[PDB]
């Protein structure tokens, strides 16, 4: 009996919903993911005076949260083009922006930056209400945050540290008794469990900053991606230990990560090529492929089933084929751009700048939806010393 | 030693751009740094804040030879700095105590400090640009 | 296979700065000590220009080929300060040092050197008045050129020279 991946038989077993399987849900969303990429719409949003986008989730289907230099929290609502700022919490003592943004694997629990760009602070989804004080288990700015578990979590730093964070039953059971009976909210006070750093290899030990993470929740593990060339395996399973380090072929500009669940890959950004990670293969043998956009580097990552989706700092998406093994061409790489946003002429553009009335909008963030038709996009200029932001949902 | 002589007097005469460097200079650029690094929110602020501290080479340079204290020498010039703004008054440099340059005969020329510093500055962004191929912009974090 | 790991890379480039910088720091100034050096030819010669000491010794290590022209570059246009601009060179190589430590990217550090060198230059108009007295001005001219060639090149101050 040969295996059926036709979508015609999913077609007919769908009407009736008797034992349909699951299985073709793999070459439903593939089909769609190679079509879907030429027949998006810009849809641009107007942030206001908003520094600039560093992260976004979906936090359900007609809002999306962003993460912003000037540490303000807010949510896109690309339902209705409207925008709702979220308050900033404080830290439990009165001692950059916000880099990341993820979700726990129970979208319960949302992980953010807090005042202080060295503290974590979490909110509660979907009433968007506060859930913790923020920590000041780091040293240094946080710019990498990722779910390990429902209640656990792992953030980075620019010393290359990493905080674990755990909620008990009883703190997460209380902070849910309180959040369901009394209708203003009520936030716990926590601190980190263990503080732990990225191990020491041949490479670069000062430029160890760990500027992005990514969980894989099929084998447990975080992986993590550091500025000094090298890409580090940890498990995070239950506890936050050391498993694995590879090389990257490029160890500049390595500020993105994403991990593809259907392939077990890890695809890490430069400046110029997204490098294909296998911890099951030796550490030299790594893949990499251009962006084409050499100079302005690679932003953000994203798997999308089979296809990559690949931020630059020329505000454009590429879009990677890995079963082809090539990058998806237009209907000549098939690539999204951003719109003008909003540039903040201001007295520091005025010094450094001053010679370039507009710069193009850098995708520092992207996500796709749940249904994977949706991909929303945000960024800012690509330059440190502009201020400026743009967002917008392609549809 | 009569090039430099002359240089510093042709540009003082044909016009009246001075410098009193020697430490006056030197801190209060070293504020107009800082100051940026305060209102610059990004991860470049750091750096900017050891450009400033950079310039106290000079005037910790000159009190260094001497048998003078450097980091006292220095205290009452940069806490100057903060009382008044674009000082003419820093470190001596012919050991008398006294923390002029009117007194002290320490002048430059205006375009010469700013010529020193701009090479400076090269030196660093050349031997800092470790591997990259291609130029890039400066790119965000 | 011998590889320079982070600071180690960098630390060839900061002892060759600070080589150059020990010598310089003791020259700045009315106040500076000047640098005798002896020529293949037997030749001696006393000098405290930064550009004279970086071209006659024998340059060994990329910086101390780079800060000959740095040096040039001043006296050629300016004249004075030769000295200088290798200090603070130097200066500024030693703090990203610590700006390595921090945990920030080198080239980001590059990056905040450059922006900060151009609010610096910027902000020198505005230093230091631009009125000036013909007798005032007189004798701390007299002053300095007396300490530029009595305490550089000639150690009994020709009076012709610093007067003329």
Known sequence: PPVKRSLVYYLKNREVRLQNETSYSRVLHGYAAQQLPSLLKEREFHLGTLNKVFASQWLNHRQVVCGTKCNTLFVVDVQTSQITKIPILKDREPGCGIHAIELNPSRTLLATGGDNPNSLAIYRLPTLDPVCVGDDGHKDWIFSIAWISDTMAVSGSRDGSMGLWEVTDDVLTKSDARHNVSRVPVYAHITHKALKDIPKEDTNPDNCKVRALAFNNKNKELGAVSLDGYFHLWKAENTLSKLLSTKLPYCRENVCLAYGSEWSVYAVGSQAHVSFLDPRQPSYNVKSVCSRERGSGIRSVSFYEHIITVGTGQGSLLFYDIRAQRFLEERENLKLTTGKGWLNHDETWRNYFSDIDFFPNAVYTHCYDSSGTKLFVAGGPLPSGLHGNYAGLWS | ?141 | KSRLMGLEALKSHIMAAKAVANTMRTSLGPNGLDKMMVDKDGDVTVTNDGATILSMMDVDHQIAKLMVELSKSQDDEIGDGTTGVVVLAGALLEEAEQLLDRGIHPIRIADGYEQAARVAIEHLDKISDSVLVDIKDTEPLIQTAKTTLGSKVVNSCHRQMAEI
């Open chain 2, 1 to 141: 030693s009569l090039h430099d002589a002359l240089c510093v007097i042709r540009n003082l005469i044909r016009d009246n751009r001075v410098v009193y460097g020697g430490g006056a200079a030197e801190i209060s650029c070293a504020l107009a740094v800082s100051q940026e690094a305060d209102k610059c929110p990004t991860l470049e602020q750091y750096a900017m804040r050891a450009f400033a501290d950079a310039l106290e080479v000079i005037p910790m340079a000159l009190s260094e030879n001497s048998g003078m204290n450097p980091i006292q020498t220095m205290t009452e010039v940069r806490a100057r700095q903060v009382k008044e703004m674009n000082p003419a008054l820093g470190i001596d440099c012919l050991h008398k105590g006294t923390n002029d340059m009117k007194q002290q005969h320490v002048i430059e020329t205006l375009i010469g400090k700013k010529q020193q510093i701009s090479l400076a500055t090269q030196m660093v962004r050349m031997i800092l640009k470790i591997d990259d191929i291609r130029k890039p912009g400066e790119s965000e974090e």
